[PDB]
C-alpha cells in the first residue's frame, strides 16, 4: 500500500538510508556528497511519515515514481546533466528508462587511493558515520552498475575492520592485511558481474538461459524441470533489469526470487534451511552462494530417453528449445562434477546431432552413436586437470608456476614479461586453491577462478595487443574461449632476444627481500631467460635454475655479498651462456 515503510520495515533506517544514498550515487555521479545526504534525510523522513500513516498524501506512489519524482527535484538538473532533464518530461515507465540512458558506465573522475592509517583511524574516529558514508558514496559513483545490497554488505566488514584495528597498538598490521582483501575481493565482484552482464548483451537469452539451466539443474538435481525452468526465467529478467542499471526492479524482482525459492524450499533444495531462515537482504546472497544438493540415485539413464527411444525427433520438433533445455537439465543433475561450459559444449552437439539426422530415412539408427562422441569432449578437460594437477604435487606451489611460466612464455613470447609473470603465478594459485579438491569438484573449481584469470588476462592483451591468437581466443564465445587457449602452439615464429648482461645481472638485495619478493625478481629472470633461447630442453632450463637457486644462498650465506654476486655471477653467467 505504501511499499516505501514497507521496505523501510523489514530494512531498517541504517539499511534504507545507505541504500537510498547509493542509488542516488549512481544516478546522479555529479552532484556533492552533501547534496545526496540531504535527499537521503528528505526521503527517509518521508518514509517515517508513511510508517506512521500509510494513507498520508503520496505515500501510495510507486518506488520508481517516488525516486524519479525526486530525481526531478535537483535542480541543477539541466545545467550538471543537460540531457537527462529532459527525461522528466515524460511519464513514469519512460521517464525511468530513459534516466538509464545517462548512466555514465567508466566515468572520468580521479582515482581513488588510501590515505595514511594515522589519518584513517582519526577520521574514522571523530565521525564514525559521515566516514564510512562518504567512501561509500565516492564508490558507488565510480560504479553505477554494481549491486547495491552487495555493496552495502562489503559496508559492514569495512565498519568492522576499523572498530577493531583502530584500537590496536599495531595499526597497519591489522588493517592493511584487511583493506586489501577487501579491495581484490570487491573488485572480484565487479569484475564477476560485469562478465555476466558482458555474456547476456553479446550471445543473449537463448543461450543465457541455457547456461542457467546447467548450473542450476546443476545446484538442484532433486527439482522437476518445470521448476527449473520457472527459475531459470525468472533468474534472466532478474539479470537482464540489473545489467540495464535498473537498482530497483532488480532488487525487487530479486526479492520476490527469493520469497518463492524459500516457500517452495521442499520443492526444490534441502540445502536452502539456512539461507531462508536469514534476514531480507541477506537471503537472495545466501541462495546465489548455495551448495549443490545431492542427487536422487534412483535416477534413470539418459540413453533411454534421449537416444534409444524412437519418436526423440518429433519431441524435438514441438519444441526445439523446450526438449535441449530437458536434455540439459538431464545430462546436468547428474554431474555436478562437469563444468557449465563442457555441459553447454555437448548441449550444443546432441543440437547439431538432431537437425543433421531428423531429415533423414532411418533416424533411429542415424544418431544412435551419439554419447560416444560425448566421450572426447569429456575427456579433454579431465586429462589437463589430471595432468596439470599431478604435476603440480611434485613441485611445490611456487615451483609449479615456474613450470608454467616456462610454459606460456613459449606459447607467446611477445607478451610484456611482467605481464607472463602475474598471468603465471595467477594460474599457479588455481591450481593449489583447487587440485586440494577430491574429483568431483575439480573441473567446477577451475571453471569458476580460471574464467576470472583468462578474463582478467583478457583485459590486459587488449590494452596492450601483441598477438593475434590470444585475441583470437578472446573474441570467441565464452564455450570456446578455455579451449582455445589451450590449443595454443609453441610460436616457431618467434626469433630469440639478444644477451643482456643487467638482465641477469643479480646484485645482493633478493638476498633481504620478501618471498614474494624473492620469488617475483627470480620468476622475471626465467622468463627471460626462456625468451633468449626458446629452444630450451626443459632439462637444460632446471639445470640452470638450480645452479641458480644454489648460487643464491651460497651468496646471501657468504660474509662478503656483492662481492659474491659479482665474482660468483660471471660464473653462473658463463656456465649457462655454455649450454
Ligand atoms: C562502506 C565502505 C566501502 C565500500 C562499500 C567499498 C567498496 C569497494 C569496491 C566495490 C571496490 C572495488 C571496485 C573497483 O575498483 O573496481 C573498492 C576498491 C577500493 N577501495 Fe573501497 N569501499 C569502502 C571503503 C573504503 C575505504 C574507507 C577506503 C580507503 C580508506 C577504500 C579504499 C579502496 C581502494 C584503494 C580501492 C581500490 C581502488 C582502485 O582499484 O583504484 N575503500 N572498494
Ligand atoms: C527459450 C529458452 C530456452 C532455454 C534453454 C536453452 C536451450 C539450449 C539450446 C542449446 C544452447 C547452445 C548454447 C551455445 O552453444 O551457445
Ligand atoms: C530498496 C529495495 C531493496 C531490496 C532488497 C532485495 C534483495 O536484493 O534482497
Ligand atoms: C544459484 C542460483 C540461485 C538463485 C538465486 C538468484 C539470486 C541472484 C540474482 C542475481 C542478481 C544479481
Ligand atoms: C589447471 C586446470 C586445467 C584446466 C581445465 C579447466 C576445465 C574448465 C573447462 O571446462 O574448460
Ligand atoms: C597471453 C599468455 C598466454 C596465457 C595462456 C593461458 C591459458 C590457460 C588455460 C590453462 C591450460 O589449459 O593450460
Given at each position: 500500500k505504501s511499499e516505501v515503510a514497507h521496505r523501510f520495515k523489514d530494512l531498517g533506517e541504517e539499511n534504507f538510508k545507505a541504500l537510498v544514498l547509493i542509488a542516488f550515487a549512481q544516478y546522479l555521479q555529479q552532484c556533492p556528497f552533501e547534496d545526496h545526504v540531504k535527499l537521503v534525510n528528505e526521503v527517509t523522513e518521508f518514509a517515517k511519515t508513511c510508517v506512521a500513516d500509510e494513507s498520508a498524501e503520496n505515500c501510495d506512489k510507486s518506488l520508481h515514481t517516488l525516486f524519479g519524482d525526486k530525481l526531478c527535484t535537483v535542480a541543477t538538473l539541466r545545467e550538471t546533466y543537460g540531457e537527462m532533464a529532459d527525461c522528466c518530461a515524460k511519464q513514469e515507465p519512460e521517464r525511468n528508462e530513459c534516466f538509464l540512458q545517462h548512466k555514465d558506465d567508466n566515468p572520468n573522475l580521479p582515482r581513488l587511493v588510501r590515505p595514511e592509517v594515522d589519518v584513517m583511524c582519526t577520521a574514522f574516529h571523530d565521525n564514525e558515520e559521515t566516514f564510512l558514508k562518504k567512501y561509500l558514496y565516492e564508490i558507488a559513483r565510480r560504479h553505477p552498475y554494481f549491486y547495491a545490497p552487495e555493496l552495502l554488505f562489503f559496508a559492514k566488514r569495512y565498519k568492522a575492520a576499523f572498530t577493531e584495528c583502530?584500537?590496536?597498538?599495531d595499526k597497519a598490521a591489522c588493517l592493511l592485511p584487511k583493506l586489501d582483501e577487501l579491495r581484490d575481493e570487491g573488485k572480484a565482484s565487479s569484475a564477476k558481474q560485469r562478465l555476466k552482464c558482458a555474456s547476456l548483451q553479446k550471445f543473449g537469452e537463448r543461450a543465457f538461459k541455457a547456461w542457467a539451466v546447467a548450473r542450476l539443474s546443476q545446484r538442484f538435481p532433486k527439482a522437476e524441470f518445470a521448476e527449473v525452468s520457472k527459475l531459470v526465467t525468472d533468474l534472466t529478467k532478474v539479470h537482464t533489469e540489473c545489467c540495464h542499471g535498473d537498482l530497483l526492479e532488480c532488487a525487487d524482482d530479486r526479492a520476490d526470487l527469493a520469497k518463492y525459492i524459500c516457500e517452495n524450499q521442499d520443492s526444490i533444495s534441502s540445502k536452502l534451511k539456512e539461507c531462508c531462515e536469514k534476514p531480507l537482504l541477506e537471503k537472495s546472497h545466501c541462495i546465489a552462494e548455495v551448495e549443490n544438493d545431492e542427487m536422487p540415485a534412483d535416477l534413470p539413464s539418459l540413453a533411454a530417453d534421449f537416444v534409444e527411444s524412437k519418436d526423440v525427433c518429433k519431441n524435438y520438433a514441438e519444441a526445439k528449445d523446450v526438449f535441449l533445455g530437458m536434455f540439459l537439465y538431464e545430462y546436468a543433475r547428474r554431474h555436478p562434477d562437469y563444468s557449465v561450459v563442457l555441459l553447454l559444449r555437448l548441449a550444443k552437439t546432441y543440437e547439431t546431432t538432431l537437425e543433421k539426422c531428423?531429415?533423414?530415412?532411418?533416424?533411429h539408427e542415424c544418431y544412435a552413436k551419439v554419447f560416444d562422441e560425448f566421450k572426447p569432449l569429456v575427456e579433454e578437460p579431465q586429462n589437463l586437470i589430471k595432468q596439470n594437477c599431478e604435476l603440480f604435487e611434485q613441485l611445490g606451489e611456487y615451483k609449479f608456476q615456474n613450470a608454467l611460466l616456462v610454459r606460456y612464455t613459449k606459447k607467446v613470447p611477445q607478451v610484456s614479461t611482467p605481464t607472463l609473470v602475474e598471468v603465471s603465478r595467477n594460474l599457479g594459485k588455481v591450481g593449489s586453491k583447487c587440485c586440494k579438491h577430491p574429483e568431483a569438484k575439480r573441473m567446477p573449481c577451475a571453471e569458476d577462478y580460471l574464467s576470472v584469470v583468462l578474463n582478467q588476462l583478457c583485459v590486459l592483451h587488449e590494452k596492450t595487443?601483441?598477438?593475434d591468437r590470444v585475441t583470437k581466443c578472446c573474441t570467441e564465445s565464452l564455450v570456446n574461449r578455455r579451449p582455445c587457449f589451450s590449443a595454443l602452439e609453441v610460436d616457431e615464429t618467434y626469433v630469440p632476444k639478444e644477451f643482456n648482461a643487467e638482465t641477469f645481472?643479480?646484485?645482493?638485495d633478493i638476498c633481504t627481500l620478501s618471498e614474494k619478493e624473492r620469488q617475483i625478481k627470480k620468476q622475471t629472470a626465467l622468463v627471460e631467460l626462456v625468451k633468449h633461447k626458446?629452444?630450451?630442453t626443459k632439462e637444460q632450463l632446471k639445470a640452470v635454475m638450480d645452479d641458480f637457486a644454489a648460487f643464491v644462498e651460497k651468496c646471501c650465506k657468504a660474509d662478503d655479498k656483492e662481492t659474491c654476486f659479482a665474482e660468483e655471477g660471471k660464473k653462473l653467467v658463463a656456465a649457462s651462456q655454455a649450454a
Open positions: 583502530c584500537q590496536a597498538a531428423c531429415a533423414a530415412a532411418d533416424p595487443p601483441v598477438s645481472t643479480f646484485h645482493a626458446p629452444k630450451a
